[PDB]
Design an enzyme around this catalytic site. Sequence first.
Site, PDB file in Angstrom:
ATOM      1  N   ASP A   1      -9.853   9.654 -15.594  1.00  0.00           N
ATOM      2  CA  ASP A   1     -10.497   8.713 -16.505  1.00  0.00           C
ATOM      3  C   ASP A   1      -9.591   8.323 -17.665  1.00  0.00           C
ATOM      4  OD1 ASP A   1     -12.759   8.799 -14.912  1.00  0.00           O
ATOM      5  OD2 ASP A   1     -13.910  10.086 -16.250  1.00  0.00           O
ATOM      6  N   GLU A   2      -8.615   9.158 -17.998  1.00  0.00           N
ATOM      7  CA  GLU A   2      -7.676   8.889 -19.073  1.00  0.00           C
ATOM      8  C   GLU A   2      -6.318   8.441 -18.553  1.00  0.00           C
ATOM      9  OE1 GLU A   2      -7.612  11.700 -22.348  1.00  0.00           O
ATOM     10  OE2 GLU A   2      -9.445  10.630 -22.966  1.00  0.00           O
ATOM     11  N   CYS A   3      -6.235   8.094 -17.269  1.00  0.00           N
ATOM     12  CA  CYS A   3      -5.056   7.548 -16.603  1.00  0.00           C
ATOM     13  C   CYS A   3      -3.938   8.570 -16.400  1.00  0.00           C
ATOM     14  CB  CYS A   3      -4.493   6.333 -17.351  1.00  0.00           C
ATOM     15  SG  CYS A   3      -5.750   5.052 -17.669  1.00  0.00           S
TER      16      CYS A   3
END
Length: 310
Positions: free
Chosen positions: A248-250
């Site tokens: 989700d935070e890459c």
Amino acid sequence: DLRKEVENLYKLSLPEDFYHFWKFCEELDPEKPADALATSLGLRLVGPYDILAGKHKMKKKPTGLNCNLHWRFYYDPPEFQTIIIGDNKTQYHMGYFRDSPDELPVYVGTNEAKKNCIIIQNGDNVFAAIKLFLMKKLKEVTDRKKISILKNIDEKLTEAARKLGYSLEQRTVKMRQRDKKVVTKTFHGAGLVVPVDKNDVGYRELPETDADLKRICKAVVDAASDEERLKAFAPIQEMMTFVQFANDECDYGMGLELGMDLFCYGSHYFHKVAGQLLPLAYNLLKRDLFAKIIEDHLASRSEENIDQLA
């Protein structure tokens, strides 16, 4: 056109040293180039070389040949494409190692699949990989006639590499530049390369050290019952949630590392979660072919009989 055929079948481009070494082997043994080094070194050219060899040709289409599985040994990650085999007692083999399916190999790696999951760097081209193997063989041979043959192959190998401009070193400038980009060794030691930007986005470390992750994996394998195995698995399930956070935070490299470590550990108890982590990681990294290779391999993770053309 065998060159186009081999790259079409594997969905991977091959470097120029691949094709030049075929020619070198044709020079050594025009009738059976893939076996030119069998008597002196105990090595055979396979994999994409089987295609150059024309071994695939006798079969009638649709053959059902899957290159993703062809000479893929038990601990070969999708980055690793076998090109040379040695003794099946150790399952010694060499392969091209690619960090991306869209990029040419970054080096030739070696592994003994009946020993462990470790991948060692052995030069950045197949001339170097064979030279380095031959040098080791030179230290073991006790027959001056066999030494003479090895010296002759060594001289021809070195001259071919000189004319073609290939380094014979175990680690080249290019390989050291690649290793600068490695964000973690992983259990196989060969390194994981994913993009990391200025703000450090692209990778984060696992919440357990490698030694502690191995301790956790061992507890899963050693578990005496299903309920015991579930309790031992709990830290891995938690790490999968941490990978969800990272995705989700890459920071897509984290799931690649966890999945790779689990695959490297080798237990079938990890195939389900490895099949969740690794295709997703590779797809998020736009390394789509590697997601297909790991899906195919996990479904058919053979210890023996990996030669699709046997």
